[PDB]
Design an enzyme around this catalytic site. Structure first.
Site, PDB file in Angstrom:
ATOM      1  N   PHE B  60       0.839  -1.187   0.000  1.00  0.00           N
ATOM      2  CA  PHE B  60       0.000   0.000   0.000  1.00  0.00           C
ATOM      3  C   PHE B  60       0.877   1.240   0.000  1.00  0.00           C
ATOM      4  O   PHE B  60       1.784   1.366   0.823  1.00  0.00           O
ATOM      5  CB  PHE B  60      -0.912  -0.017   1.221  1.00  0.00           C
ATOM      6  CG  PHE B  60      -2.022  -1.029   1.118  1.00  0.00           C
ATOM      7  CD1 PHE B  60      -1.771  -2.391   1.299  1.00  0.00           C
ATOM      8  CD2 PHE B  60      -3.324  -0.621   0.841  1.00  0.00           C
ATOM      9  CE1 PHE B  60      -2.799  -3.315   1.200  1.00  0.00           C
ATOM     10  CE2 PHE B  60      -4.351  -1.545   0.732  1.00  0.00           C
ATOM     11  CZ  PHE B  60      -4.091  -2.885   0.907  1.00  0.00           C
ATOM     12  N   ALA B  61       0.631   2.144  -0.944  1.00  0.00           N
ATOM     13  CA  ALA B  61       1.357   3.389  -0.981  1.00  0.00           C
ATOM     14  C   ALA B  61       0.367   4.547  -1.115  1.00  0.00           C
ATOM     15  O   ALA B  61       0.032   4.997  -2.233  1.00  0.00           O
ATOM     16  CB  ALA B  61       2.383   3.370  -2.099  1.00  0.00           C
ATOM     17  N   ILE B  62      -0.110   4.998   0.046  1.00  0.00           N
ATOM     18  CA  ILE B  62      -1.177   5.991   0.153  1.00  0.00           C
ATOM     19  C   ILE B  62      -0.577   7.317   0.609  1.00  0.00           C
ATOM     20  O   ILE B  62       0.330   7.355   1.443  1.00  0.00           O
ATOM     21  CB  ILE B  62      -2.276   5.517   1.146  1.00  0.00           C
ATOM     22  CG1 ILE B  62      -2.826   4.124   0.759  1.00  0.00           C
ATOM     23  CG2 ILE B  62      -3.418   6.524   1.263  1.00  0.00           C
ATOM     24  CD1 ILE B  62      -3.509   4.065  -0.572  1.00  0.00           C
ATOM     25  N   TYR B  65       3.446   8.156   1.044  1.00  0.00           N
ATOM     26  CA  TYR B  65       4.187   6.882   1.022  1.00  0.00           C
ATOM     27  C   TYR B  65       4.464   6.361  -0.384  1.00  0.00           C
ATOM     28  O   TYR B  65       5.215   5.396  -0.558  1.00  0.00           O
ATOM     29  CB  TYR B  65       3.469   5.825   1.861  1.00  0.00           C
ATOM     30  CG  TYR B  65       3.671   5.975   3.341  1.00  0.00           C
ATOM     31  CD1 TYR B  65       3.292   7.141   4.007  1.00  0.00           C
ATOM     32  CD2 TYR B  65       4.238   4.954   4.087  1.00  0.00           C
ATOM     33  CE1 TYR B  65       3.460   7.266   5.376  1.00  0.00           C
ATOM     34  CE2 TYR B  65       4.416   5.070   5.446  1.00  0.00           C
ATOM     35  CZ  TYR B  65       4.033   6.222   6.090  1.00  0.00           C
ATOM     36  OH  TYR B  65       4.207   6.323   7.464  1.00  0.00           O
ATOM     37  N   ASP B 140       4.697  -3.916   4.414  1.00  0.00           N
ATOM     38  CA  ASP B 140       4.865  -2.455   4.472  1.00  0.00           C
ATOM     39  C   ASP B 140       5.689  -1.953   3.277  1.00  0.00           C
ATOM     40  O   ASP B 140       6.594  -2.644   2.788  1.00  0.00           O
ATOM     41  CB  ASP B 140       5.571  -2.053   5.770  1.00  0.00           C
ATOM     42  CG  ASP B 140       4.635  -1.881   6.947  1.00  0.00           C
ATOM     43  OD1 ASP B 140       3.535  -2.463   6.982  1.00  0.00           O
ATOM     44  OD2 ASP B 140       5.035  -1.163   7.887  1.00  0.00           O
ATOM     45  N   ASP B 142       7.413   1.077   3.286  1.00  0.00           N
ATOM     46  CA  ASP B 142       8.595   1.830   3.768  1.00  0.00           C
ATOM     47  C   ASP B 142       9.733   0.887   4.150  1.00  0.00           C
ATOM     48  O   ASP B 142      10.193   0.856   5.287  1.00  0.00           O
ATOM     49  CB  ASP B 142       8.203   2.764   4.930  1.00  0.00           C
ATOM     50  CG  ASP B 142       7.583   2.030   6.108  1.00  0.00           C
ATOM     51  OD1 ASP B 142       6.816   1.051   5.901  1.00  0.00           O
ATOM     52  OD2 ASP B 142       7.824   2.461   7.272  1.00  0.00           O
ATOM     53  N   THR B 174       3.963  -6.148  23.298  1.00  0.00           N
ATOM     54  CA  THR B 174       2.979  -5.057  23.282  1.00  0.00           C
ATOM     55  C   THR B 174       1.656  -5.476  22.649  1.00  0.00           C
ATOM     56  O   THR B 174       1.117  -4.773  21.792  1.00  0.00           O
ATOM     57  CB  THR B 174       3.514  -3.804  22.575  1.00  0.00           C
ATOM     58  OG1 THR B 174       3.977  -4.137  21.256  1.00  0.00           O
ATOM     59  CG2 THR B 174       4.662  -3.202  23.363  1.00  0.00           C
ATOM     60  N   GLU B 232      -1.637  -4.781  13.581  1.00  0.00           N
ATOM     61  CA  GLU B 232      -0.668  -5.671  14.202  1.00  0.00           C
ATOM     62  C   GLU B 232      -1.207  -6.345  15.455  1.00  0.00           C
ATOM     63  O   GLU B 232      -0.885  -7.506  15.706  1.00  0.00           O
ATOM     64  CB  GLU B 232       0.628  -4.923  14.494  1.00  0.00           C
ATOM     65  CG  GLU B 232       1.723  -5.728  15.172  1.00  0.00           C
ATOM     66  CD  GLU B 232       3.008  -4.926  15.246  1.00  0.00           C
ATOM     67  OE1 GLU B 232       3.760  -4.909  14.242  1.00  0.00           O
ATOM     68  OE2 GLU B 232       3.239  -4.261  16.282  1.00  0.00           O
ATOM     69  N   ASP B 255      15.506  -3.516  11.421  1.00  0.00           N
ATOM     70  CA  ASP B 255      15.823  -2.094  11.380  1.00  0.00           C
ATOM     71  C   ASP B 255      17.217  -1.921  11.934  1.00  0.00           C
ATOM     72  O   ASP B 255      17.427  -1.966  13.168  1.00  0.00           O
ATOM     73  CB  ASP B 255      14.808  -1.325  12.203  1.00  0.00           C
ATOM     74  CG  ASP B 255      15.025   0.180  12.163  1.00  0.00           C
ATOM     75  OD1 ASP B 255      16.111   0.664  11.768  1.00  0.00           O
ATOM     76  OD2 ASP B 255      14.087   0.862  12.575  1.00  0.00           O
TER      77      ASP B 255
HETATM   78  O1  LIG Z   1      -0.043   7.525   5.149  1.00  0.00           O
HETATM   79  C1  LIG Z   1       0.159   6.296   5.061  1.00  0.00           C
HETATM   80  C2  LIG Z   1       0.316   5.519   6.214  1.00  0.00           C
HETATM   81  C3  LIG Z   1       0.523   4.144   6.076  1.00  0.00           C
HETATM   82  N1  LIG Z   1       0.576   3.590   4.831  1.00  0.00           N
HETATM   83  C4  LIG Z   1       0.796   2.151   4.632  1.00  0.00           C
HETATM   84  O2  LIG Z   1       0.709   1.532   5.906  1.00  0.00           O
HETATM   85  C5  LIG Z   1       1.977   0.944   6.221  1.00  0.00           C
HETATM   86  C6  LIG Z   1       2.128   0.997   7.729  1.00  0.00           C
HETATM   87  O3  LIG Z   1       2.333   2.337   8.160  1.00  0.00           O
HETATM   88  P1  LIG Z   1       3.767   2.737   8.753  1.00  0.00           P
HETATM   89  O4  LIG Z   1       4.793   2.008   7.928  1.00  0.00           O
HETATM   90  O5  LIG Z   1       3.743   4.219   8.921  1.00  0.00           O
HETATM   91  O6  LIG Z   1       3.658   2.129  10.238  1.00  0.00           O
HETATM   92  P2  LIG Z   1       4.815   1.409  11.102  1.00  0.00           P
HETATM   93  O7  LIG Z   1       5.095   2.325  12.262  1.00  0.00           O
HETATM   94  O8  LIG Z   1       5.992   0.989  10.268  1.00  0.00           O
HETATM   95  O9  LIG Z   1       3.955   0.154  11.574  1.00  0.00           O
HETATM   96  C7  LIG Z   1       3.379  -0.012  12.895  1.00  0.00           C
HETATM   97  O10 LIG Z   1       2.535   1.084  13.349  1.00  0.00           O
HETATM   98  C8  LIG Z   1       1.284   1.282  12.655  1.00  0.00           C
HETATM   99  C9  LIG Z   1       0.483   2.486  13.185  1.00  0.00           C
HETATM  100  O11 LIG Z   1       1.042   3.734  12.750  1.00  0.00           O
HETATM  101  C10 LIG Z   1       1.910   4.320  13.724  1.00  0.00           C
HETATM  102  C11 LIG Z   1       2.784   5.425  13.149  1.00  0.00           C
HETATM  103  C12 LIG Z   1       2.344   6.245  12.105  1.00  0.00           C
HETATM  104  C13 LIG Z   1       3.173   7.258  11.607  1.00  0.00           C
HETATM  105  C14 LIG Z   1       4.449   7.480  12.137  1.00  0.00           C
HETATM  106  C15 LIG Z   1       4.936   6.694  13.180  1.00  0.00           C
HETATM  107  C16 LIG Z   1       4.148   5.670  13.709  1.00  0.00           C
HETATM  108  N2  LIG Z   1       4.633   4.877  14.760  1.00  0.00           N
HETATM  109  O12 LIG Z   1       5.173   3.810  14.523  1.00  0.00           O
HETATM  110  O13 LIG Z   1       4.483   5.308  16.082  1.00  0.00           O
HETATM  111  C17 LIG Z   1       0.460   0.008  12.780  1.00  0.00           C
HETATM  112  O14 LIG Z   1       0.175  -0.245  14.166  1.00  0.00           O
HETATM  113  C18 LIG Z   1       1.253  -1.142  12.174  1.00  0.00           C
HETATM  114  O15 LIG Z   1       0.521  -2.373  12.243  1.00  0.00           O
HETATM  115  C19 LIG Z   1       2.579  -1.317  12.911  1.00  0.00           C
HETATM  116  O16 LIG Z   1       3.313  -2.388  12.295  1.00  0.00           O
HETATM  117  C20 LIG Z   1       3.003   1.652   5.344  1.00  0.00           C
HETATM  118  O17 LIG Z   1       4.176   0.882   5.068  1.00  0.00           O
HETATM  119  C21 LIG Z   1       2.190   1.863   4.084  1.00  0.00           C
HETATM  120  O18 LIG Z   1       2.191   0.678   3.263  1.00  0.00           O
HETATM  121  C22 LIG Z   1       0.414   4.403   3.696  1.00  0.00           C
HETATM  122  O19 LIG Z   1       0.460   3.892   2.555  1.00  0.00           O
HETATM  123  N3  LIG Z   1       0.211   5.729   3.843  1.00  0.00           N
HETATM  124 MN   LIG Z   2       6.362   0.622   8.176  1.00  0.00          MN
END
Ligand SMILES: O=c1ccn([C@@H]2O[C@H](COP(=O)(O)OP(=O)(O)O[C@H]3O[C@H](COCc4ccccc4[N+](=O)O)[C@H](O)[C@H](O)[C@H]3O)[C@@H](O)[C@H]2O)c(=O)[nH]1
Ligand SMILES: [Mn+2]
Ligand SMILES: O=c1ccn([C@@H]2O[C@H](COP(=O)(O)OP(=O)(O)O[C@H]3O[C@H](COCc4ccccc4[N+](=O)O)[C@H](O)[C@H](O)[C@H]3O)[C@@H](O)[C@H]2O)c(=O)[nH]1
Ligand SMILES: [Mn+2]
EC number: 2.4.1.40
Lengths: 274, 274
Positions: B60-62, B65, B140, B142, B174, B232, B255
């Site tokens: 997903f690339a929304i 992203y 993911d 990223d 967690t 998650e 990471d």
């Molecule tokens: O605007 C978007 C958004 C997502 N995606 C898509 O969703 C994926 C997951 O989002 P992330 O990779 O951001 O999440 P992870 O932290 O890696 O992932 C964690 O934290 C998340 C909550 O956000 C917590 C969170 C949000 C922002 C910053 C720090 C954060 N944090 O961690 O405290 C969830 O709890 C996840 O399940 C968890 O694994 C991206 O790779 C994109 O594919 C999009 O396309 N477009």
């Molecule tokens: Mn991620």
């Protein structure tokens, strides 16, 4: 479709502690090798019970080998798939010699009236069981159960490590070594030496295996050759070319008279008769 | 129906030598835990190629992203399922922002036009892929591939060990800890802490998982509660109750910025972006 497991309390798996440090617990094709200490039987029992699993067990008792049935079945009652549905199939030329053994609930026995060792592949193939069981387990009758043999073994296709060769080099394996035989395996090939006395799997995969080995044996017969260890040689060729999805340790196929009780075996489950 | 493997020459598995002495390589329910040194990729590649396996990968690339796609896809081309058929599915709100990346033979990409993290379960469920791929891998965006990620991961249902918790006690996981949430896990339960960023399986099992988690999320929403780690948390509840058939080591979800490169990781395969 598989429903959810209920809440259960058990010790946490330890990612940074191997379950065994003395043995290989997974094959290079990522099939588990089943040793004591690799499995939690409460979890597996849950999983298989939720599927109402039925296990068929085939055994041949031809001519004088009818004398092995009483101990075989009595000890199966004590240690084989206890708590699950079981269907024994006893292949014999003397239906009247089959001993009367008391079975636990959910367990039944059928008597099927019928070189001998070899012909098992053919007979198992023809009876492929499809409507009556989910898995088939195919064993020698001159044996007894001395400890747990349960659903940890169940998988689409399994073989068992022959107890005479689990520590041996592949060069020393007693594979069929003549290119003229369909069971031929070169000295630079081979994963394991699997025992003819204990294999199994889903009905479909067992039918496939037994059909293939029967076909191989017929070709060899037509060609005037007989494999050095007969069915076991063909089993080994089949499992080299079609890797099993689980491999049983020699806990599941042992002879304490000839081999004692090494430290590497924590349990002796299915053994030769003294 | 699976045809025979051809003759291959490779080192003999060593039954009396564990493949790894520093890590658990099998779960207590006999699912392999995939680490470097547990698998022979030549054997697995044979097995999967003989089945003409096709692997779908969802990403997903929304919104912003979309900027992660170029590196993600370029590095996937280098390291993801090379030699097998692959179908990328890129879910995005900006089809025009998808970069033009050159694909190897047998590989194709589809652009599907469409809180964000959570809604993935719903969208994956609805697109369940059934006619076009054998397995689905859900990750993911990223991230980048830095080393081999191949058919060793494929199985009916897999999760990946979250890199922040593979050495932790279950008390420290967690998980969602409020009984009001459908994702609730008590302190005395839990096998592993699985990462939301990398799971998969057969299409059927993935559809099942994603449907279940979506349904759970809707119940929570109706109940005015949101799980502490969203998708998650629900993934972790689903995998506690429906055990995966393979578990990926943190080699597959890492990471290096936050965690370095410990001796226990021989390869860093799929990593966060610096
Ligand atoms: O605007 C978007 C958004 C997502 N995606 C898509 O969703 C994926 C997951 O989002 P992330 O990779 O951001 O999440 P992870 O932290 O890696 O992932 C964690 O934290 C998340 C909550 O956000 C917590 C969170 C949000 C922002 C910053 C720090 C954060 N944090 O961690 O405290 C969830 O709890 C996840 O399940 C968890 O694994 C991206 O790779 C994109 O594919 C999009 O396309 N477009
Ligand atoms: Mn991620
Ligand atoms: O009159 C029978 C016969 C068999 N069966 C049934 O066949 C099974 C296998 O036979 P065994 O258990 O005898 O075989 P194993 O040696 O354990 O088994 C080995 O040696 C065999 C050849 O015989 C080699 C052999 C034959 C005789 C004596 C010593 C031998 N030896 O080893 O050198 C084959 O090569 C086997 O594949 C191999 O595992 C029995 O358990 C019964 O179920 C009957 O019902 N009725
Ligand atoms: Mn015997």
């Amino acid at each position: 479709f598989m429903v959810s497991l209920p809440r259960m309390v058990y010790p946490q798996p330890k990612v940074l502690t191997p379950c065994r440090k003395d043995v290989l617990v997974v094959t290079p094709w990522l099939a588990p090798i089943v040793w004591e200490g690799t499995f939690n039987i409460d979890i597996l029992n849950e999983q298989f019970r939720l599927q109402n699993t039925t296990i068929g067990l085939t055994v041949f008792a031809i001519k004088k080998y009818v004398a092995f049935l009483k101990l075989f079945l009595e000890t199966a009652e004590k240690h084989f798939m206890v708590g699950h549905r079981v269907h024994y199939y006893v292949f014999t030329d003397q239906p009247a010699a089959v001993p009367r053994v008391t079975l636990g609930t959910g367990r039944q026995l059928s008597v099927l009236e019928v070189d001998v060792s070899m012909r098992r592949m053919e007979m198992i193939s023809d009876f492929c069981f499809l409507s009556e069981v989910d898995y088939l387990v195919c064993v020698d009758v001159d044996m007894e159960f001395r400890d747990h043999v349960g659903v940890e073994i169940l998988t689409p296709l399994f073989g068992t490590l022959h107890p005479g060769f689990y520590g041996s080099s592949r060069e020393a394996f007693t594979y069929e070594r003549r290119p003229q035989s369909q069971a031929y395996i070169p000295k630079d090939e081979g994963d394991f030496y699997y025992g003819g006395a204990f294999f199994g799997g889903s009905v479909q995969e067992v039918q496939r295996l037994t059909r293939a080995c029967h076909q191989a044996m017929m070709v060899d017969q037509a060609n005037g050759i007989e494999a050095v260890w007969h069915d076991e040689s063909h089993l080994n060729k089949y499992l080299l070319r079609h890797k099993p999805t689980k491999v049983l340790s020699p806990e599941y196929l042992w002879d304490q008279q000839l081999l004692g009780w090494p430290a590497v075996l924590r349990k002796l489950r299915f053994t030769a008769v003294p």
